[PDB]
């Protein structure tokens, strides 16, 4: 029961098997060969079944380069899809698409349990009946864009804003407070950025609670396809067995659809409106529907989205936006001013900011803060051109309080201690709401402006002002 190679057309290989022994769809195949003479090259490849043709012919997709292949070679059938090891062994390790370790710390014993990559979605009866809010400990997120337990969060931003720092502090806070586990998956991104992130994690010491899977831009589309599924099947084990709360990071979801669009051309399918594959919606749904919260545990994901040419009518962004629940925007102008994490208070929105979920007091405080910030933003040109004079007695108070609010929106992180000596803090939602309410009321109008920078709780502002000699 072994096959033969018939056609090689790049990343697509056709295999013919004996009658009555065709492998099932999504099964994995192995090709192992040794050079018989000086005109041959050793080959080691992995294949997966995609389509079933008529005369006992199967069309597959390559997981690596197909150079050196010769018609008539031998193919071995494994009888099962790709399997990836799971458990506590994967903590603090780096894996490829196939699950083989990349770092030089050794190999995983062959007796460890493994799970298939593909799996059906959970049923209707197993889902939760109510909405819950996940607490992170960051003032801006907890006040203006709350995160729900089990939803999808979209992140927008370029380089040099502190995305890695934000990810590190989120992982640290979640692990410290809820005892969760974080999983990172990089799809079609820069190897230099991946290495920098890995070294930063090693320096910070957060690597002991994270498992990493890397499929990068230099990989073929077949390899780039399965990275997200490998990360998801690694993450699902902790929810299914330990009943914990798990964070899942996806570096870029646009490349996931782009690779499928590239692959579908060679399989003989008709083109779509903008040249994409006709199964884009189903492919996206079959992956997104597996991130849900059940009665035993929960999984929540933060995804970074890149919009090509700033065109929001593109089919891939249009399909991806239908699954999001909240967005966070990073501002270079805020980054330059010295405010961290430089999250835009007005651009970021959330679905959970409703009086039926967060509370009337929280809703009113958030609405008032948004209103005063929006009012302050409109005076920029007038102030810059004509100076602070010629302003009414009301706009002057508005800009007096807006600076205090904007400076109080900042915070100091645990992971930044190694460069400044400041331990960091974890601020509850009730505390931050009470502090913002007091600031809006105006009990601290006589304090200096610089006393509101990187403090945390409201009560530390008074101590900082006293230390300043006020």
């Amino acid at each position: 029961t072994r096959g033969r190679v018939i056609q090689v057309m790049g990343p697509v290989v056709d295999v013919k098997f004996e009658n009555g022994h065709l492998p099932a769809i999504y099964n994995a195949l192995k090709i192992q060969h040794k050079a018989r003479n000086e005109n041959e090259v050793d080959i080691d490849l992995t294949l997966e079944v995609a389509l079933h043709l008529g005369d006992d012919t199967v069309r597959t997709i390559a997981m690596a380069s197909t150079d050196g292949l010769i018609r008539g070679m031998e193919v071995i059938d494994t009888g099962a899809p790709i399997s990836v090891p799971v458990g506590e062994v994967t903590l603090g390790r780096v894996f490829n698409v196939l699950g083989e370790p990349i770092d030089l710390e050794g190999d995983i014993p062959a007796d460890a349990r493994r799970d298939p990559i593909h799996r059906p979605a959970p049923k209707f009866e197993e889902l939760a009946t109510e909405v819950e809010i996940l607490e992170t400990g960051i003032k801006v997120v907890d006040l203006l864009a709350p995160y729900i337990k089990g939803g999808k969060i979209g992140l927008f931003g370029g380089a040099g804003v502190g995305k890695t720092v934000l990810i590190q502090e989120l992982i640290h806070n979640i692990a410290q407070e809820h005892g969760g586990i974080s999983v990172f998956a990089g799809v079609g991104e820069r190897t230099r950025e991946g290495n920098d992130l890995y070294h930063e994690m090693k320096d910070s010491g957060v690597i002991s609670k994270t498992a990493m899977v890397f499929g990068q831009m230099n990989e073929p589309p077949g390899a780039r396809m399965r990275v997200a599924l490998t990360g998801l099947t690694m993450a699902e084990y902790f929810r299914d067995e330990q009943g914990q709360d798990v964070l899942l990071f996806i570096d870029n979801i646009f490349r996931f659809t782009q690779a499928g669009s590239e692959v579908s051309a060679l399989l003989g399918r008709m083109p779509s409106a903008v040249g994409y594959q006709p199964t884009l919606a189903t492919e996206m749904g079959q992956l997104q529907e597996r991130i849900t919260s059940t009665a035993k545990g929960s999984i929540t994901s933060i995804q970074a989205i890149y919009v090509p040419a700033d065109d929001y009518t593109d089919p891939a962004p249009a399909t991806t936006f239908s699954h999001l629940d909240a967005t966070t925007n990073l501002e270079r102008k805020l980054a330059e001013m010295g405010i961290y994490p430089a999250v835009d208070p007005l651009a970021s929105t959330s679905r959970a900011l409703a009086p039926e979920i967060v509370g009337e007091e929280h809703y009113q405080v958030a609405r008032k803060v948004q209103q005063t910030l929006q009012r302050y933003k409109e005076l920029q040109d007038i102030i810059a051109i004509l100076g602070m004079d010629e302003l009414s007695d009301e706009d002057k108070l508005v800009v007096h309080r807006a600076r205090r609010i904007q400076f109080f929106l900042s915070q100091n992180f645990h992971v930044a201690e190694q460069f400044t000596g400041q331990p960091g803090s974890y601020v509850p939602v009730k505390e931050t709401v009470r502090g913002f309410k007091e600031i809006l009321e105006g009990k601290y109008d006589h304090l200096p402006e610089d006393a509101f920078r990187l403090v945390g709780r409201i009560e530390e502002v008074v101590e900082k002002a006293k230390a300043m000699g006020v």
């Binding site: 003989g268 008709m270 083109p271 409106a273 040249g275």
Partner: protein
């Protein structure tokens, strides 16, 4: 002085009206090229799709 002030106000009003008229004139000349580009995009994309489909 009073006569000069009145003349100044009248001149300002006339200038503003002329500016509004000029902008209203320019709008439609923009819209014509808008429509032409709108037709061109569709006529390109449908031909591209048909040519791609005919390859198989």
């Amino acid at each position: 002085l009073l006569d000069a002030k009145a003349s100044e106000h009248a001149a300002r009003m006339t200038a503003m009206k002329n500016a509004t008229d000029n902008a209203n004139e320019l709008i439609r000349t923009l819209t014509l090229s808008y429509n032409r580009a709108r037709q061109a995009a569709i006529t390109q994309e449908i031909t591209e799709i048909v040519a791609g489909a005919n390859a198989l």
